[PDB]
Write an enzyme that holds these catalytic residues in place. Structure first.
Site, PDB file in Angstrom:
ATOM      1  N   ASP A 294      -1.147  -1.441  -1.498  1.00  0.00           N
ATOM      2  CA  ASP A 294      -0.419  -2.581  -2.081  1.00  0.00           C
ATOM      3  C   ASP A 294      -0.842  -2.755  -3.538  1.00  0.00           C
ATOM      4  O   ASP A 294      -1.895  -3.342  -3.831  1.00  0.00           O
ATOM      5  CB  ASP A 294      -0.775  -3.815  -1.298  1.00  0.00           C
ATOM      6  CG  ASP A 294      -0.058  -5.056  -1.821  1.00  0.00           C
ATOM      7  OD1 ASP A 294       0.852  -4.883  -2.622  1.00  0.00           O
ATOM      8  OD2 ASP A 294      -0.433  -6.162  -1.370  1.00  0.00           O
TER       9      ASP A 294
ATOM     10  N   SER B 249      11.019  -4.396 -18.013  1.00  0.00           N
ATOM     11  CA  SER B 249      12.174  -3.523 -18.002  1.00  0.00           C
ATOM     12  C   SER B 249      13.101  -3.872 -19.163  1.00  0.00           C
ATOM     13  O   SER B 249      13.197  -5.046 -19.548  1.00  0.00           O
ATOM     14  CB  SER B 249      12.900  -3.632 -16.640  1.00  0.00           C
ATOM     15  OG  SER B 249      14.104  -2.970 -16.616  1.00  0.00           O
TER      16      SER B 249
END
Ligand code: NA
Length: 330
Positions: free
Chosen positions: A35, A199
């Site tokens: 994770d 992004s």
């Protein structure tokens, strides 16, 4: 040194991925959920409340000649999905894919929440976010990656998750055979303890690319892609009969649909998520309503590039002095 381990989806939907991990001497192999959005290595154990264990493999520290109680240390964690676990701490030898760390903090669960008990395939978590998020008190502990780092050939790990198929976690090297084209690297903020990046925008299907900054985290422990409501609405507007359902808890769509792809930007590069990756199947067994793999982040307080996005790429988690992320097509 290096390590290389195969990661396998737990079910037909790629809800999560498990990777075998050797703990203790002689080895006890547990299947952990790696994770990148958390920083605790915790396991089902011989200490876990018996009614909260249902099929998981447990770590038994008393059977490991290298286990030592980390006296006085406790831990307690709560995840984004509402799940939780807590317990005490041992140090032991931990190996992943041939890479060994001695003295790793292995957090032994005394209590786990119902979602962990109900998932017999996941024996615990191995956190790969920054060690500043580790929950051990009173002495915070390091992740497996942070303890391995100085021994690695390069201070990196890579995630290569499969779509309905096994993939790979590598430590200490880039496998130049595992991706196509070049790797585009992007800046990381560690201020919240995550692999947080920005992004450069998105496209829906064959539509034009929208240049827009989207801050979010690269999180292998989250199944879906969680993005701002504007972006998510623009995606689902291209699917006839898709709607946000408050009763189901997100966007659903007709199981008869063909989903469009979703593209996200990494600098000037583009990662394309095929439409099929966004289908999470019937909302309940036999339903003709299917659950979407792109969902709104509104109320979560962060955008999350979970497995839906990451499995479309070869992802480099660069833990050099200035961390960065890299993405390549594959
Ligand atoms: Na669900």
């Amino acid at each position: 040194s290096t390590g290389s381990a195969t990661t396998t989806p737990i079910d037909s939907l790629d809800d999560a991925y498990i990777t075998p991990v050797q703990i203790g001497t002689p080895a006890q192999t547990l299947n952990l959920d790696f994770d990148t959005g958390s920083s605790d290595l915790w396991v089902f154990s011989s200490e876990t409340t018996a009614s909260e264990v249902d099929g998981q493999t447990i770590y038994t520290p008393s059977k490991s000649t290298t286990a030592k109680l980390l006296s006085g240390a406790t831990w307690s964690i709560s995840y984004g999905d509402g799940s939780s676990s807590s317990g005490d701490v041992y140090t032991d030898t931990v190996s992943v894919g041939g890479l060994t760390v001695t003295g790793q903090a292995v957090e032994s669960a005394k209590k786990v929440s119902s979602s962990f008990t109900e998932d017999s395939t996941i024996d615990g978590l191995l956190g790969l976010a920054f060690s500043t998020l580790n929950t051990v008190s009173p002495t915070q502990q390091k992740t497996f990656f942070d303890n391995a780092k100085a021994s690695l050939d390069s201070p990196v790990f890579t995630a290569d998750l499969g779509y309905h198929a096994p993939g790979t976690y590598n430590f200490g090297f880039i496998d130049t055979t595992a991706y196509t084209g070049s790797i585009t690297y992007t800046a990381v903020s560690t201020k919240q303890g995550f692999w947080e990046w920005t992004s450069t925008g998105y496209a829906v299907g064959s539509g034009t690319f929208k240049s827009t900054s989207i801050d979010g985290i690269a999180d292998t422990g989250t199944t879906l892609l969680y993005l701002p409501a504007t972006v998510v609405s623009a995606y689902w507007a291209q699917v006839s009969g898709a709607k946000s359902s408050s009763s189901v808890g997100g966007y659903v769509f007709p199981c008869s649909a063909t989903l469009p792809s979703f593209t996200f930007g990494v600098g000037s590069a583009r990662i394309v998520i095929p439409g099929d990756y966004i289908d999470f199947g019937p909302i309940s067994t036999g339903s003709s309503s299917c659950f979407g793999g792109i969902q709104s982040s509104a109320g979560i307080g962060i955008n999350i590039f979970g497995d839906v996005a990451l499995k479309a790429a070869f992802v480099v988690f660069n833990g050099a002095t200035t961390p960065t992320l890299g993405f390549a097509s594959k």
